[PDB]
Design an enzyme around this catalytic site. Sequence first.
Site, PDB file in Angstrom:
ATOM      1  N   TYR A  36       0.821  -1.207   0.000  1.00 52.92           N
ATOM      2  CA  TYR A  36       0.000   0.000   0.000  1.00 52.92           C
ATOM      3  C   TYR A  36       0.857   1.261   0.000  1.00 52.92           C
ATOM      4  CZ  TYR A  36       1.158   0.770   4.931  1.00 52.92           C
ATOM      5  OH  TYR A  36       1.827   0.966   6.121  1.00 52.92           O
ATOM      6  N   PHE A  46       2.044   9.950   3.328  1.00 55.25           N
ATOM      7  CA  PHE A  46       2.402   9.740   4.736  1.00 55.25           C
ATOM      8  C   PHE A  46       3.072   8.398   5.041  1.00 55.25           C
ATOM      9  CE2 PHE A  46      -2.200   8.677   4.671  1.00 55.25           C
ATOM     10  CZ  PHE A  46      -2.213   7.417   5.265  1.00 55.25           C
ATOM     11  N   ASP A  47       2.868   7.407   4.172  1.00 55.08           N
ATOM     12  CA  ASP A  47       3.437   6.068   4.363  1.00 55.08           C
ATOM     13  C   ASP A  47       3.338   5.204   3.106  1.00 55.08           C
ATOM     14  OD1 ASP A  47       4.855   4.363   6.118  1.00 55.08           O
ATOM     15  OD2 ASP A  47       3.055   3.251   6.671  1.00 55.08           O
ATOM     16  N   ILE A  66      -7.876  -0.024  10.335  1.00 61.15           N
ATOM     17  CA  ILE A  66      -8.996   0.914  10.255  1.00 61.15           C
ATOM     18  C   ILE A  66     -10.165   0.289   9.501  1.00 61.15           C
ATOM     19  CG2 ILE A  66      -7.583   3.020  10.549  1.00 61.15           C
ATOM     20  CD1 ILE A  66      -7.785   3.471   7.484  1.00 61.15           C
ATOM     21  N   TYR A  92      -9.367   7.447  11.130  1.00 59.33           N
ATOM     22  CA  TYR A  92      -8.880   7.835  12.460  1.00 59.33           C
ATOM     23  C   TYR A  92      -9.729   8.871  13.230  1.00 59.33           C
ATOM     24  CZ  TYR A  92      -4.784   5.070  11.090  1.00 59.33           C
ATOM     25  OH  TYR A  92      -3.965   4.045  10.662  1.00 59.33           O
TER      26      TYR A  92
HETATM   27  C1  FK5 Z   1       2.514  -3.178  17.588  1.00 65.67           C
HETATM   28  C2  FK5 Z   1       3.061  -1.853  17.228  1.00 65.67           C
HETATM   29  C3  FK5 Z   1       2.261  -0.864  16.405  1.00 65.67           C
HETATM   30  C4  FK5 Z   1       1.779  -1.535  15.115  1.00 65.67           C
HETATM   31  C5  FK5 Z   1       2.697  -1.175  13.980  1.00 65.67           C
HETATM   32  C6  FK5 Z   1       2.968  -2.080  12.849  1.00 65.67           C
HETATM   33  C7  FK5 Z   1       2.672  -3.551  12.953  1.00 65.67           C
HETATM   34  C8  FK5 Z   1       3.579  -1.533  11.572  1.00 65.67           C
HETATM   35  C9  FK5 Z   1       2.526  -0.949  10.632  1.00 65.67           C
HETATM   36  C10 FK5 Z   1       2.975  -1.079   9.172  1.00 65.67           C
HETATM   37  C11 FK5 Z   1       2.191   0.483  11.068  1.00 65.67           C
HETATM   38  C12 FK5 Z   1       2.786   1.630  10.231  1.00 65.67           C
HETATM   39  O1  FK5 Z   1       4.102   1.970  10.621  1.00 65.67           O
HETATM   40  C13 FK5 Z   1       5.000   2.081   9.535  1.00 65.67           C
HETATM   41  C14 FK5 Z   1       1.926   2.893  10.289  1.00 65.67           C
HETATM   42  O2  FK5 Z   1       0.896   2.732   9.341  1.00 65.67           O
HETATM   43  C15 FK5 Z   1       0.253   3.942   8.993  1.00 65.67           C
HETATM   44  O3  FK5 Z   1       1.242   4.888   8.509  1.00 65.67           O
HETATM   45  C16 FK5 Z   1      -0.699   3.597   7.845  1.00 65.67           C
HETATM   46  O4  FK5 Z   1      -0.273   3.817   6.521  1.00 65.67           O
HETATM   47  C17 FK5 Z   1      -1.973   3.060   8.058  1.00 65.67           C
HETATM   48  O5  FK5 Z   1      -3.082   3.933   8.197  1.00 65.67           O
HETATM   49  N1  FK5 Z   1      -2.204   1.740   8.111  1.00 65.67           N
HETATM   50  C18 FK5 Z   1      -1.173   0.730   7.824  1.00 65.67           C
HETATM   51  C19 FK5 Z   1      -1.702  -0.222   6.755  1.00 65.67           C
HETATM   52  C20 FK5 Z   1      -3.123  -0.718   7.028  1.00 65.67           C
HETATM   53  C21 FK5 Z   1      -4.119   0.389   7.350  1.00 65.67           C
HETATM   54  C22 FK5 Z   1      -3.590   1.336   8.431  1.00 65.67           C
HETATM   55  C23 FK5 Z   1      -3.759   0.796   9.837  1.00 65.67           C
HETATM   56  O6  FK5 Z   1      -5.097   0.626  10.271  1.00 65.67           O
HETATM   57  O7  FK5 Z   1      -2.753   0.560  10.580  1.00 65.67           O
HETATM   58  C24 FK5 Z   1      -2.970  -0.036  11.873  1.00 65.67           C
HETATM   59  C25 FK5 Z   1      -3.359   0.976  12.941  1.00 65.67           C
HETATM   60  C26 FK5 Z   1      -2.513   2.196  13.221  1.00 65.67           C
HETATM   61  C27 FK5 Z   1      -4.597   0.760  13.722  1.00 65.67           C
HETATM   62  C28 FK5 Z   1      -5.099   1.737  14.753  1.00 65.67           C
HETATM   63  C29 FK5 Z   1      -4.874   1.147  16.148  1.00 65.67           C
HETATM   64  C30 FK5 Z   1      -5.428   2.047  17.263  1.00 65.67           C
HETATM   65  C31 FK5 Z   1      -6.902   2.384  17.037  1.00 65.67           C
HETATM   66  O8  FK5 Z   1      -7.274   3.395  17.948  1.00 65.67           O
HETATM   67  C32 FK5 Z   1      -7.196   2.889  15.618  1.00 65.67           C
HETATM   68  O9  FK5 Z   1      -8.598   2.981  15.452  1.00 65.67           O
HETATM   69  C33 FK5 Z   1      -9.031   4.274  15.095  1.00 65.67           C
HETATM   70  C34 FK5 Z   1      -6.590   1.991  14.534  1.00 65.67           C
HETATM   71  C35 FK5 Z   1      -1.720  -0.831  12.291  1.00 65.67           C
HETATM   72  C36 FK5 Z   1      -1.253  -1.775  11.190  1.00 65.67           C
HETATM   73  C37 FK5 Z   1      -1.853  -1.567  13.643  1.00 65.67           C
HETATM   74  O10 FK5 Z   1      -2.801  -2.612  13.582  1.00 65.67           O
HETATM   75  C38 FK5 Z   1      -0.533  -2.177  14.132  1.00 65.67           C
HETATM   76  C39 FK5 Z   1       0.356  -1.149  14.789  1.00 65.67           C
HETATM   77  O11 FK5 Z   1      -0.151   0.136  15.085  1.00 65.67           O
HETATM   78  C40 FK5 Z   1      -0.457   4.534  10.226  1.00 65.67           C
HETATM   79  C41 FK5 Z   1      -1.017   5.936   9.975  1.00 65.67           C
HETATM   80  C42 FK5 Z   1       0.430   4.534  11.477  1.00 65.67           C
HETATM   81  C43 FK5 Z   1       1.284   3.270  11.633  1.00 65.67           C
HETATM   82  O12 FK5 Z   1       2.255   3.503  12.628  1.00 65.67           O
HETATM   83  C44 FK5 Z   1       1.806   3.118  13.908  1.00 65.67           C
END
Ligand code: FK5
Length: 237
Positions: A36, A46-47, A66, A92
């Site tokens: 992605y 952003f990523d 998400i 988010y």
């Molecule tokens: C165990 C350690 C942390 C763990 C980190 C990893 C495994 C590495 C993984 C590639 C994270 C990335 O790091 C390079 C980075 O990915 C982003 O840049 C991004 O492009 C993104 O939007 N993605 C990633 C791809 C799938 C969709 C989405 C996501 O849903 O991601 C999920 C997410 C943040 C969910 C939140 C959780 C809290 C709730 O409150 C909220 O609900 C509102 C939803 C991720 C995958 C989590 O399940 C797992 C983690 O967080 C985020 C902008 C911020 C994130 O950094 C943290």
Amino acid sequence: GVDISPKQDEGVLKVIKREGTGTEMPMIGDRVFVHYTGWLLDGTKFDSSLDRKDKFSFDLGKGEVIKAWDIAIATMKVGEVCHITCKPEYAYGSAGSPPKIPPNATLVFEVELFEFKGEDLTEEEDGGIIRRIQTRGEGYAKPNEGAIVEVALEGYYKDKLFDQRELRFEIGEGENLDLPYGLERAIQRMEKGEHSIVYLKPSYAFGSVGKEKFQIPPNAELKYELHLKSFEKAKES
Ligand SMILES: C=CC[C@@H]1/C=C(\C)C[C@H](C)C[C@H](OC)[C@H]2O[C@@](O)(C(=O)C(=O)N3CCCC[C@H]3C(=O)O[C@H](/C(C)=C/[C@@H]3CC[C@@H](O)[C@H](OC)C3)[C@H](C)[C@@H](O)CC1=O)[C@H](C)C[C@@H]2OC
């Protein structure tokens, strides 16, 4: 983009850039492998997983990602490249995700689906019991040890039907009814009304013994199509 949110409120919009292959689409419980890239609406990148080593991997419909992603990946075929636009309610929200994602932000993702596989239900994660959900059940409760369950099952060995029954039995007593242990373990992971396919390696089926009256030889892999129709949970300690 086409509106694919179940509430049809334009929360998730999808544009297919490249058509995928075949017919199957990942279902809840499936492990999914993607690349992605993510942008803010103004165009700020952003990523991206392409900047990292391997593909991004997650379990679908288990709330790891998400909401927009659970919704969108469930519509993709293998090989498909799409663009999704995600409203804040489906990403988010008010909280945002600092420092990358600001409050109340609309997101755009480019996603490529490379592969998906069924959920490994074994305690050892050795691939011996694999589930592909066909249709999710209606309740959240699951049968426990000693539960009386009502199931409809079809068992296949090399795609030949060897068993087709509707059964009422106690979890833990299935051996007497010629059900393999791995199948009873799988049923404890099912919701009322769930329709699923379970794949069993020999260690989780009839093993080195086989099952002569079903024409199943030693060391056979098996496939079951199962409906859990109802159950009453047993008392626990
Ligand atoms: C165990 C350690 C942390 C763990 C980190 C990893 C495994 C590495 C993984 C590639 C994270 C990335 O790091 C390079 C980075 O990915 C982003 O840049 C991004 O492009 C993104 O939007 N993605 C990633 C791809 C799938 C969709 C989405 C996501 O849903 O991601 C999920 C997410 C943040 C969910 C939140 C959780 C809290 C709730 O409150 C909220 O609900 C509102 C939803 C991720 C995958 C989590 O399940 C797992 C983690 O967080 C985020 C902008 C911020 C994130 O950094 C943290």
